[PDB]
Design a protein around this ligand. Structure first.
Ligand SMILES: *[C@](O)(C(N)=O)[C@H](C[C@@H]1CCNC1=O)NC(=O)[C@H](CC1CC1)n1cncc(NC(=O)OC(C)(C)C)c1=O
Ligand SMILES: CC(C)(C)OC(=O)Nc1cncn([C@@H](CC2CC2)C(=O)N[C@@H](C[C@@H]2CCNC2=O)[C@H](O)C(N)=O)c1=O
Lengths: 305, 304
């Protein structure tokens, strides 16, 4: 009973967070085996950030210019390299708490947990979606760079996100763990703006199924729609096209609740057209789009790790 | 910038979660030092649940009737007792992952993180508030009993909640870690009701300050109110009365933003009387009441 924005348990990731300091700049790193991964702009002074030449800045740094602390222990850096926008620091010690892990590149619409860290110390955990415009609506202050996003996939931590910057409107951008930005952004202090954001339609439908599973039924109606007609309406509300694959993905939730996907699309249509009339769904007055179909099943079926 | 519902990192609590089984009932326990804490209804079958006599059910159990599993390992139970609605199983091994901890009883309006567990294994973490009606709005399935709620301060985990039951409205009830229920609830299969809840005003004000910190400023007005006049309106909308203590705890945010608490009250009064008129605050079209003043400062100032 109940439905909450739910993060993955963070323990396996907490045991990988370290502090990386280069001169004036301190941010977070991810310590896996004998490598520490962090944003390459740790090597930049405030001034360098306008127009950094990263190759040239890094060739001027010795291993001694990097201070890496894991709790009360200093890790000795014995090597450094840059891969895209990530710096990799080889250290003399492998992390004894390294979990089984992979680096993954996620897709717009997918969700993940963020462990917000400052000074190499975890401060909190929350759930995020990769927006259609390749930003995330995060919560990140100065010092949070190098915080990561992850999923737990069976027996594996899947790192998908490392935090680098804030964009206009107070949304966030970053890289995968190979150092490649999500979206067209660059790691310099410059005029950058994201595309118009859109609502992740398949996720809204999944959340409406979560609402039905939790006994929140007022918005169900006896109407149906075709996929084409639904899309004609939803585009007027800045919703992403619902594809036949999305319909197919929602099949398990459909079978569980006994509500056909196109019937739920007709319910959604009516909520878009008429609004909620002062009513709420699962405690919300807006339609929520940051739960995937898989997230709903996980929560509603009590999947563990 | 940004503002999200944020939980504490769960790892310190993960290392304390175990599975407790007694006959055919299995739920979660909390292993701290050489004691496992779990809901006492682990000793019940469905038939006992109508009106269980716990003293007698317990006496008929022995130590070997409690199967405690910590991951792969079975822990040997060497003693058992009952404290209010919690069972305490003494085991022969102290948990080496025990964090610094304390047991606290929280007040309505205060927030905490929940680590939802099944079969002694973590499923997810989320943030809850103790409601004025002494329920929480959680997310809990069969198997979740014994999951705990907590806050972390420095290195110290303050455990404040252990999950026991679901109520008709889809809300949840439980105890502190001394086994005392929050609210008037009891651990039997009686028909039980939360009854009407109210909105945590001091938390709404904290969240409006968060909005201002984040640059959402549209709801600020030039109106004035007094604590008396504010409270008359608040109570008309089933908001908790704002007290001087609440005014005092909002001091830091008021200072940070330069907006007096009663000016923010004048803003809230307008929102309650008129609504948001198609605008949103921090991505919401409702006034959010599950962030405390401390939660806002922590998040908008980044403590670790
Ligand atoms: C990061 O380096 C850290 N030390 O934590 C930091 C994180 C941001 C601080 C505020 N919110 C954050 O997410 N990132 C930055 O400071 C980046 C570094 C550049 C990518 C190399 N950065 C630097 N200057 C400016 C911005 N953002 C900015 O000016 O945003 C607005 C246009 C004002 C919205 C930035 O993110
Ligand atoms: C009518 C509705 C709304 C459906 O409410 C009930 O019927 N509630 C209850 C009736 N009888 C017993 N319990 C408790 C036990 C008693 C002594 C207090 C119970 O089943 N709690 C469980 C956790 C529960 C079940 C699903 N969601 C949860 O939160 C639990 O013990 C574990 N093993 O998970 C109930 O909550």
């Amino acid at each position: 009973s109940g439905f909450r924005k739910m993060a993955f348990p963070s323990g396996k990731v907490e045991g990988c967070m370290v502090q990386v300091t280069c001169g004036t700049t301190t941010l977070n790193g991810l310590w896996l085996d004998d490598v520490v991964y962090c944003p390459r702009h740790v090597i930049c002074t405030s001034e360098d950030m306008l127009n950094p030449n990263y190759e040239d800045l890094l060739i001027r740094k010795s291993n001694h210019n990097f201070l890496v602390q894991a709790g009360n222990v200093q890790l000795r850096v014995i090597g450094h390299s840059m891969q895209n926008c990530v710096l990799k620091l080889k250290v003399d010690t492998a992390n004894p708490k390294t979990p089984k892990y992979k680096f993954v590149r996620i897709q717009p619409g997918q969700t993940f947990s963020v462990l917000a860290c400052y000074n190499g110390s975890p401060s909190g955990v929350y759930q995020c979606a990769m927006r259609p415009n390749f930003t995330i609506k995060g919560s990140f202050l100065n010092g949070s760079c190098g915080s990561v996003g992850f999923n737990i996939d069976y027996d594996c931590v899947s790192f998908c996100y490392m935090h680098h910057m804030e964009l206009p409107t107070g949304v966030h951008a970053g890289t995968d763990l190979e150092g490649n930005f999500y979206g067209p952004f660059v790691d310099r202090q410059t005029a950058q703006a994201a595309g118009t954001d859109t609502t992740i339609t398949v996720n809204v439908l999944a959340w409406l199924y979560a609402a039905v599973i939790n006994g929140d039924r007022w918005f169900l109606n006896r109407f149906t729609t075709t996929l084409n007609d639904f899309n004609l309406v939803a585009m007027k509300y800045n919703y992403e096209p619902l594809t036949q694959d999305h319909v197919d993905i929602l099949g398990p939730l459909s079978a569980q609740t006994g509500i056909a996907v196109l019937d739920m699309c007709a319910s959604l249509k009516e909520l878009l057209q008429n609004g909620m009339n002062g009513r709420t769904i699962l405690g919300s007055a807006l339609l929520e789009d940051e739960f995937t179909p898989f997230d709903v099943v996980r929560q509603c079926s009590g999947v563990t790790f």
